[PDB]
Design an enzyme around this catalytic site. Structure first.
Site, PDB file in Angstrom:
ATOM      1  CG  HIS A  33      28.216 -12.928   3.165  1.00 43.62           C
ATOM      2  ND1 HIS A  33      29.701 -12.234   3.168  1.00 43.62           N
ATOM      3  CD2 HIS A  33      27.260 -11.876   3.353  1.00 43.62           C
ATOM      4  CE1 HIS A  33      29.223 -10.437   2.765  1.00 43.62           C
ATOM      5  NE2 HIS A  33      28.519 -10.981   2.199  1.00 43.62           N
TER       6      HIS A  33
ATOM      7  CG  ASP B  19      17.515 -18.480   1.276  1.00 45.37           C
ATOM      8  OD1 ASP B  19      17.925 -19.034   1.542  1.00 45.37           O
ATOM      9  OD2 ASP B  19      17.658 -17.508   1.287  1.00 45.37           O
TER      10      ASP B  19
ATOM     11  CD  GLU C  48      20.795 -17.147  -2.397  1.00 48.74           C
ATOM     12  OE1 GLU C  48      21.874 -16.935  -1.380  1.00 48.74           O
ATOM     13  OE2 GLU C  48      19.370 -16.904  -1.587  1.00 48.74           O
TER      14      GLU C  48
ATOM     15  CD  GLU D 155      21.641 -13.321  -1.448  1.00 49.61           C
ATOM     16  OE1 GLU D 155      22.461 -13.561  -0.780  1.00 49.61           O
ATOM     17  OE2 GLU D 155      20.054 -14.029  -0.599  1.00 49.61           O
TER      18      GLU D 155
ATOM     19  CG  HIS E  26      27.171 -14.066   0.028  1.00 50.06           C
ATOM     20  ND1 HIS E  26      26.462 -14.542   0.630  1.00 50.06           N
ATOM     21  CD2 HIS E  26      25.320 -13.890  -0.196  1.00 50.06           C
ATOM     22  CE1 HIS E  26      26.251 -15.975   0.375  1.00 50.06           C
ATOM     23  NE2 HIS E  26      25.099 -15.749   0.442  1.00 50.06           N
TER      24      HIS E  26
ATOM     25  CG  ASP F 147      22.124 -19.069  -0.015  1.00 50.74           C
ATOM     26  OD1 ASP F 147      21.490 -19.028   0.395  1.00 50.74           O
ATOM     27  OD2 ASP F 147      23.147 -17.654   0.513  1.00 50.74           O
TER      28      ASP F 147
HETATM   29  C1  LIG Z   1      21.906 -10.267   6.762  1.00 52.79           C
HETATM   30  C2  LIG Z   1      22.679 -10.360   5.263  1.00 52.79           C
HETATM   31  C3  LIG Z   1      21.782 -10.249   4.220  1.00 52.79           C
HETATM   32  O1  LIG Z   1      22.988 -11.890   5.794  1.00 52.79           O
HETATM   33  C4  LIG Z   1      24.404 -11.900   5.984  1.00 52.79           C
HETATM   34  C5  LIG Z   1      25.708 -11.195   6.361  1.00 52.79           C
HETATM   35  C6  LIG Z   1      26.713 -11.476   6.698  1.00 52.79           C
HETATM   36  N1  LIG Z   1      27.962 -10.294   7.460  1.00 52.79           N
HETATM   37  C7  LIG Z   1      28.164  -9.895   5.790  1.00 52.79           C
HETATM   38  C8  LIG Z   1      28.945  -8.309   6.307  1.00 52.79           C
HETATM   39  N2  LIG Z   1      29.745  -9.059   7.519  1.00 52.79           N
HETATM   40  C9  LIG Z   1      29.616 -10.058   8.571  1.00 52.79           C
HETATM   41  C10 LIG Z   1      28.941 -11.239   7.877  1.00 52.79           C
HETATM   42  C11 LIG Z   1      26.752 -13.217   7.252  1.00 52.79           C
HETATM   43  C12 LIG Z   1      26.068 -14.022   7.123  1.00 52.79           C
HETATM   44  C13 LIG Z   1      24.400 -13.112   6.131  1.00 52.79           C
HETATM   45  C14 LIG Z   1      23.847 -14.465   5.790  1.00 52.79           C
HETATM   46  C15 LIG Z   1      23.398 -14.994   4.724  1.00 52.79           C
HETATM   47  C16 LIG Z   1      23.319 -14.720   2.943  1.00 52.79           C
HETATM   48  N3  LIG Z   1      24.186 -13.460   2.780  1.00 52.79           N
HETATM   49  O2  LIG Z   1      23.063 -15.087   2.360  1.00 52.79           O
HETATM   50  N4  LIG Z   1      22.574 -16.161   4.964  1.00 52.79           N
HETATM   51  C17 LIG Z   1      22.173 -16.282   6.784  1.00 52.79           C
HETATM   52  C18 LIG Z   1      22.001 -17.165   7.074  1.00 52.79           C
HETATM   53  C19 LIG Z   1      21.269 -17.320   7.869  1.00 52.79           C
HETATM   54  F1  LIG Z   1      20.824 -18.552   8.914  1.00 52.79           F
HETATM   55  C20 LIG Z   1      22.488 -16.090   9.329  1.00 52.79           C
HETATM   56  F2  LIG Z   1      22.663 -16.501  10.438  1.00 52.79           F
HETATM   57  C21 LIG Z   1      23.720 -15.259   8.639  1.00 52.79           C
HETATM   58  C22 LIG Z   1      23.472 -14.907   6.978  1.00 52.79           C
HETATM   59 MN   LIG Z   2      23.078 -15.750   0.262  1.00 52.37          MN
HETATM   60 MN   LIG Z   3      20.091 -17.879   0.152  1.00 57.71          MN
END
Ligand SMILES: CC(C)Oc1cc(N2CCNCC2)ccc1-c1c(C(N)=O)[nH]c2cc(F)c(F)cc12
Ligand SMILES: [Mn+2]
Ligand SMILES: [Mn+2]
Length: 365
Positions: free
Chosen positions: A230, A142, A346, A251, A222, A153
């Site tokens: 996100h 990823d 994804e 995803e 998301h 993403d």
């Molecule tokens: C834990 C979850 C899977 O991924 C997240 C939750 C959040 N939060 C939601 C709730 N509100 C606060 C932010 C934010 C960002 C992500 C996130 C994602 C994604 N979802 O694709 N990919 C990433 C890559 C990274 F290197 C990182 F550091 C973070 C992410």
């Molecule tokens: Mn994602």
């Molecule tokens: Mn991803």
């Protein structure tokens, strides 16, 4: 100009006029009542509103072309015997070249995930990690690219043992179902319900054991915003609608375990809290580290290897301070139960006024 083997030519050099290849363009799904949303393709108002944002879709397209070319290269050499570090460095070296890395204007949106087996997401090796990819590993690649903060993403699963083929098939089908059901005014929970139905329709046999594939219910699709991986809207597996001009990461994750992930192993991924404003810091190492983060990443995610490559050392306490202050959030690896297998697919989709574009679609997935 033509692309080399291994790829080294920036995508913007392959398309000098700054017009990049479109992804897969789809007519929006019909509503419950059966009436088509095909009118969007031919609407003069929609065509004008679409062309007003052409520069934006174009930045996503450049980042999606870098993603397609990087991942096709990765697939040609990723093999058991390679260390996780070697894999991530070889992938990222190519990504930086094709995206034509330029501070915060073009670059890597987030660290290379290469989560293994029961671990579904957010594992990338830290310095000194001796982990070697194995023949029986199920590896989730990823990685993200961006142009002006327009993030791609996009992720796939790597395997060498055919025993996982049906699990990969189930997840790919669930992701593709989520992408098909997505649309302007479509309820987020309806996309989630469609994903779940397809995912659970598969039963798989791995090393003499059978399983009904479970979607991981706390790893959701998301919305994506500028420099924001996100943007706050989630596609839930277990009221909110998708809106015109929004961008989503669709995803899905399939598991032979509990279908729930928990924080496990040491943390490698970090990202500044998007909503935190300027915070004055006097502690010298902490202040220096935050300045390094602001200059190099801003609100985009990073990993410890990315601090090491900038010549930073003795920063762990400084990084913990930023996490404790809530300026930076840690994103540890998310794993299902020991002995379980997880898979992921994804794509990034653009909800353009005229059509739905699966901007990161390739001939691979
Ligand atoms: C834990 C979850 C899977 O991924 C997240 C939750 C959040 N939060 C939601 C709730 N509100 C606060 C932010 C934010 C960002 C992500 C996130 C994602 C994604 N979802 O694709 N990919 C990433 C890559 C990274 F290197 C990182 F550091 C973070 C992410
Ligand atoms: Mn994602
Ligand atoms: Mn991803």
């Amino acid at each position: 100009k033509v692309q080399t083997d291994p790829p080294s030519v920036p995508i913007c050099d392959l398309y000098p006029n700054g017009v990049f290849p479109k992804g897969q363009e789809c007519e929006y799904p019909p509503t419950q009542d059966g009436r088509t949303a095909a009118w969007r393709t031919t609407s003069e108002e929609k065509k004008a509103l679409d062309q007003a944002s052409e520069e934006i879709w174009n930045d996503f397209r450049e980042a999606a072309e870098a993603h397609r070319q990087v991942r096709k290269y990765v697939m040609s050499w990723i093999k058991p015997g390679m260390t996780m570090i070697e894999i991530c460095e070889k992938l990222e070296d190519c990504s930086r070249k094709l995206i034509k890395e330029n501070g915060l204007n073009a670059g890597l949106a987030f660290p290379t995930g290469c989560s293994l087996n029961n671990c579904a997401a957010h594992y990338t090796p830290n310095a000194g990690d001796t982990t070697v990819l194995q023949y029986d590993d199920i590896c989730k690649i990823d990685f993200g690219t961006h142009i002006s903060g327009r993030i791609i993403d996009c992720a796939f699963t790597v395997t060498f043992n055919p025993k996982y083929d049906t699990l990969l098939k189930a997840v790919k089908d669930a992701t593709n179902t989520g992408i098909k059901c997505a649309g302007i005014d479509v309820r987020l929970c309806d996309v989630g319900e469609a994903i779940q139905e397809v995912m659970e329709s598969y039963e798989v046999e791995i090393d003499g054991k059978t399983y009904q594939v479970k979607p991981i219910r706390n790893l959701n699709g998301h919305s994506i915003g500028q420099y924001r991986i996100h943007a706050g809207k989630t596609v839930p597996i277990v009221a909110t609608r998708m809106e015109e001009g929004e961008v989503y990461a669709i995803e899905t994750f399939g598991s032979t375990g509990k279908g729930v992930v928990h924080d496990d192993m040491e943390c490698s991924h970090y990202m500044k809290n998007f909503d935190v404003g300027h915070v004055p810091i006097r502690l010298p190492r902490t202040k220096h580290l935050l300045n390094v983060i602001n200059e190099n990443f801003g609100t985009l995610a990073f990993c410890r290897r990315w601090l090491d490559r900038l010549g930073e050392s003795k920063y762990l306490m400084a990084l913990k301070n930023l996490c404790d202050l809530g300026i930076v959030d840690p994103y540890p690896p998310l794993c299902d139960i020991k002995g379980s297998y997880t898979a992921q697919f994804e794509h990034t989709i653009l909800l353009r006024p005229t059509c739905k574009e699966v901007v990161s679609r390739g001939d691979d997935y």
